[PDB]
């Protein structure tokens, strides 16, 4: 079992030509690997594109095409569309064993970039009766759909007891997310400040609350 490598993410605009590659650690990617290409839409639908290195599946638009660039298998989208923003997976054959790649998340700028809106909730009184406290931080309406989250208690960073959801697409083709910070009801009354920091494209949006 060899390992198949792809580019983590790429960004482009409509009308432009973008090239994705597919690397093989155990040598080079030849014609005898029969490169496969599958697309996964952010709604998780899965559609086959390319087989046998360069054969389009029946029904696939002419803007999709596969080829071999030097020692790597490649997918070329000439005249990219807004509907092309999705995750693309690569698959190489090996004797009698198909290995899949990590996938490449392609972003297509079909709408203006947007800073995420952040809401923060303090733990409810009922949960405190169970000696537990959970702060909820909701992150909605951002584009592109990549966000990192950090927490801060009393101005000091906490990297423990945190959990963030993965970005899912909204109805307006934007993205949304949330995060939970669980503490004890004892710790909830033994500190003061709580902060949820959302970093999106270089800029940081921050929302805080103080138990008062």
């Amino acid at each position: 079992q060899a390992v198949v490598t792809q580019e983590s993410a790429l960004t482009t605009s409509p009308g432009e030509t973008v090239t994705l590659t597919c690397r093989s650690s155990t040598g080079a990617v030849t014609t005898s690997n029969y490169a496969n290409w599958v697309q996964e839409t952010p709604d998780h639908l899965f559609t086959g594109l390319i087989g046998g290195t360069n054969n389009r599946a029946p029904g696939v638009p002419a803007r999709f095409s596969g080829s071999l660039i030097g020692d790597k298998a490649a997918l070329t989208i000439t005249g990219a569309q807004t509907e092309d923003e999705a995750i693309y997976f690569c698959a190489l054959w090996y004797s009698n064993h198909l290995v899949f790649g990590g996938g490449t998340k392609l972003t297509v700028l079909g709408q203006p970039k947007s800073s995420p809106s952040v809401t923060l909730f303090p733990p409810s009184s009922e949960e405190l009766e169970t000696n537990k406290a959970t702060l909820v931080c909701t992150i909605t309406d951002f584009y592109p759909g990549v966000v990192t989250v950090d927490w801060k208690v009393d101005g000091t960073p906490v990297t423990q007891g945190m959990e963030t959801t993965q970005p899912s697409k909204q109805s307006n083709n934007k993205y949304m997310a949330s995060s939970y910070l669980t503490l004890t009801a004892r710790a909830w009354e033994r500190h003061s400040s709580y902060s949820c920091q959302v970093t999106h494209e270089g800029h940081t949006v921050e929302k805080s609350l103080s138990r008062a």
Partner: protein, 212 residues
């Protein structure tokens, strides 16, 4: 058997591949395993033309592929079910060397976990901003197994502004949030709710979002 997703550790499931891939082709039929972490894994391929099967060495003792040309059927039967097999098992139809058509995607959950009803806690706003004024409210659905749960707002009257985030696995138990936004002419003046129903063991909760 079966497909309501929940099965005992040590059981043996059997799935089927069906859609509208239309008569004609299906020269090969592949099967793919999708899971948060291991990504896409290839189980094997069956050639309905003469029966010829190929299996991944990892799933040679656990997977069995069958198909007939009578009712255009194509089955996979698993056995010795561990919680490792908890994944989304897809099916891929297509011609020679083509992962053309993909199916719905059968969810499979293997766990010894007991069934636990959910508990809902209201989430009041407070000094933690919600964008463009208005009023953002929500609920915390925490500690339920298995999936899913359904959340509504104002008995269904209240759409728009609703954001039901996906559930994050939190130590053998599921947990999700769900925000909603209404003008101040509704809150804190009048009614906001909030119905979290949980099928598997049945549960129906009503929570009035009373201010802090």
């Amino acid at each position: 058997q079966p497909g309501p997703e929940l099965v005992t550790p040590g059981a043996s499931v059997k799935m089927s591949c069906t859609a509208s891939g239309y008569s004609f082709s299906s020269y090969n039929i592949h099967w793919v395993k999708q899971t948060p972490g291991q990504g896409l894994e290839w189980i094997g391929v069956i050639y309905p033309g003469n029966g010829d099967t190929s299996y991944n060495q990892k799933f040679r003792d656990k997977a069995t592929l069958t198909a007939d040309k009578s009712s255009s059927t194509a089955y996979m039967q698993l056995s010795s079910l561990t919680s490792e097999d908890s994944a989304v098992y897809h099916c891929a139809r297509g011609g020679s060397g083509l992962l053309a058509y993909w199916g719905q995607g059968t969810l499979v959950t293997v766990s010894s976990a007991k069934t636990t009803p959910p508990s809902v806690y209201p989430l009041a706003p407070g000094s933690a901003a919600q964008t463009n004024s208005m009023v953002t409210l929500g609920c915390l659905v925490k500690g339920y197994f298995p999936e899913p749960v359904t959340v509504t707002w104002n008995s269904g009257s209240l759409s728009s502004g609703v954001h039901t985030f996906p559930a994050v696995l939190q130590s053998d138990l599921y947990t999700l949030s769900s925000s909603v936004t209404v003008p101040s002419s509704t809150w804190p003046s009048e009614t906001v709710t909030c119905n979290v129903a949980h099928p598997a063991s049945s549960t129906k909760v009503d929570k009035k979002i009373v201010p802090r």
